[PDB]
Every structure is written in structure tokens, then in C-alpha cells.
Amino acid sequence: NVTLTAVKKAFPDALTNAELVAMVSKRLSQFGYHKYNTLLATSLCSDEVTRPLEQDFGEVYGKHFTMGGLAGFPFGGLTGFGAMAGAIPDGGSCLLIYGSHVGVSWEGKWGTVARRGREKGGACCGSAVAAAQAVTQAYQATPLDAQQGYVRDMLRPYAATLSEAEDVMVTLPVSVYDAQQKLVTRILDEGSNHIDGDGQIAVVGGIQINTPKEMSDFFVVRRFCIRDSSGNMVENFMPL
Amino acid sequence: NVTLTAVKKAFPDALTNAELVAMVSKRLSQFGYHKYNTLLATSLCSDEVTRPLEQDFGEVYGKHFTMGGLAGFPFGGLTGFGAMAGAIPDGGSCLLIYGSHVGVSWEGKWGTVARRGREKGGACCGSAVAAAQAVTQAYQATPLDAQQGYVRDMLRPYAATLSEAEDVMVTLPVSVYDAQQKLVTRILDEGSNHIDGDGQIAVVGGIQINTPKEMSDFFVVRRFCIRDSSGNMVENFMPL
């Protein structure tokens, strides 16, 4: 209950995984998205704690393409998006789920969550937290590891915001989501041509909240829309 | 059948996914790898067709960390490896599954495989095939997309091999695996520190063979070994 209260204090609109998948699949079914004709894609952190969300959508839409990497950025990039587009069922569409993530503990502390078989869970999101430390310290001072370098690069503009935050562990996944949303939008704008005529791309973006094992995880929806083959938005389902 | 003949012709030692998981789990159980104390990690291509292998090992060892990206290279890098190591159950170990992959069609043609809801399946591995084309064409003339650039980079040493190949589609996954094995070894040598004392890293590396839907997928084991927290190889299970 302390955890759940903390979740809803920071994010009053947060949905359980079950609520999210039910809502998204119900809405998209009105627009012709079904199992046979939808290709699922995710851009979520490589951390094992993010797997339940992929599994919950995969029960609906089947095996998914991954475009993510550390902290959930779409490191698959243009080539990854094109690979995905090239696998969409004929006359069908893609559903992309992306976001940052953050752990919240049994005592409602953000930025950490208990991990299986460990007494100390450590940071969640680990990549984002390490990156935030590096960019804020450098700010306050007024391919072997290329991904983590990119995470620092994309987090650098938020250094002031992070340093001034009341709770940096809540502000961090919001900033990471903002950086992701920009990059995803750029990729979709560039790889627009790869979607065939009638085909669409539905997008769900937000913040994944990883809770202790006895609890459902949660998701904060910040983007839920459909774009056409020409890169144009044709439906916006926000706000919920 | 035609597909199975092609598979065994080029890869006599290929195992079905079921055979692979049975063999690996049986062997590692003799070395104390069980569900409660093992953290599963993969470095496989972002392509949706590679998911069954993750699911099959996931049934035994649970939710996995991902390290992969385009063509299955360990793009998570040092930070990704450290993130994984920091989540290993106390006193437990990691199991890393990595590999290239390749499609084989109902007609026994390499480098392609039928995809759900599609008349044309396109390349498999798409990323590797595109990279191969680029580096062999360049040879024969004697963040937005950084991963594919890295794939081209790591395949460049193999340009002569690929251009001389009798069937480049059957040679390509072997070259990709060779490039992967070097990078994985480098990451494990660097991030050895992150494993604590008694903890080990078990490694399975090879070539994932993606077959038509009515058929089992296969895997060609090229590496199956155990390393200790100091980076030393303590067991080598090859050849099977």
C-alpha cells in the first residue's frame, strides 16, 4: 500500500500492465489492429525488469521486434526501424511500445527495486542513474561502451533540470522519456517511406514503473497515437 | 524435408531448440546452475524471429537481460554487462546465450525465411545481409543509425571471405558469429571485475537457424564454456 500510494502520488494517471494492455488493444481494435495483421515492436531498457511489459503485449500481438537498448533508447535506429517495417504483415500495421523505466521500492523510494535473489537491488534504471550522475556532476562543475555514451549525450541537456529536481529519481525517468520521445519522432519521420500505403504505425510511449514482485507493474502513458504512411498523425488518443 | 536437408548439409551438428536447451541445462545443473541462482542474458538480433530461442531458455531460467542489437552484436557493451552482473543472484551465476542468425526457406535457400502475414519474407539476417553487401561492394572496388554502422565496421575484416564465398548467405552467419565471439570475449575480459568471487559466467555461442513456422528452429553450438570471476576458463564443453 505504501508503494501503491507512492506510485499514484507521483503519477496519478498510472495504469497497471493489465489495464494498459486492455486499454490499448481495445482502442486499436476499433482501428483494425488485430493479431494476424499487427507487428509488435518495443523500445525498452535491456534490464530484465522490463520483460513483463513485453510479455503482456506479446500475449496479444505475438513475437516482437526490439529496437531498444540501455535506458530504453531506440538504438536500433533507422536500420532497425526499416527491418521492422519490412516485417509488417501485408496491408497490416506496427504497434511500437517505448519508454523509460524506474523502480519503486517496498518503502516507496524511487530509483531502486528489489531484485530476485539479491539483498541489495541497486539502481533502476541503472543506466539512466549512472548517466544522470555523470552529466549533473559535470554541470555542477559549472562500440565497446558506445550505448552508455549515447545515454549521457542525450541526458546532458537535462543536467540543470536534474540538479534542481526535488526528487531526481522521479524527474530522471521523465527526462529520459522526453529524450526518447524526440528520438523516436525523428526516426519515424525519417523512416516514413518504409511503411506501405495503407499501413500505419501506432505508438505508445511513457514511463514503465517496476514494483516489488508481489505487485503489478505500472505504466504512465504520455503518448498514444496513430501515424500514417506519410508520417502524418491521424489519431491522437491523449489524454486518457 | 528440403529445409532440414539444407540445414544438416551445411551444419551437421545443428541442434533443435529443444535439444539445445535440454543439453545446456542438463550440463550446467551439474555445476550448480539452477533457476533460483542463475541470471539469463542474451545477445541475439533484434529481429522478431530470434524470440523463440529466448523464450525457450526463459522457460528454464526466467526473465533475461538483453545485450544484443542489430545482427546480434553485444551493443549493450561494458555498461550493459555490468548492469547484468549487478543483478546476478547472491552467490549465483550468469548464463549468456549469443549468436548470429540466418533464415532458411521451405525451398532450402539461405538468407531468407517466410514471415507471418507476408508474401515475401525478405532478408534474414537483414542487418547482416545489408552490411555484407556494403563491405563486399567496397572491397570489390579493390545515434540515428549508429548500430548498422558498427555492423559494417565489424564485418569489414571479412569482406574477402564474403566476396569469395560459394554461397555468401550460408557463409555470412559464420563470419558474423566470428566477429561476435571476439567482441563478447573482449567484453568478458574487461568486465570480469563485476562478477563476485564465487560467481561464474557460462557462455553459449553460435548460429541461430530460423526455419519455416511448421518446423523447429535450430542452433549450431560453436562455444559452450564456463569462466570464473577472474576471467579464467574453468570448463570447456566443446565438442558436444
Ligand SMILES: [Zn+2]
Ligand atoms: Zn534500465
Ligand SMILES: [Zn+2]
Ligand atoms: Zn537479424
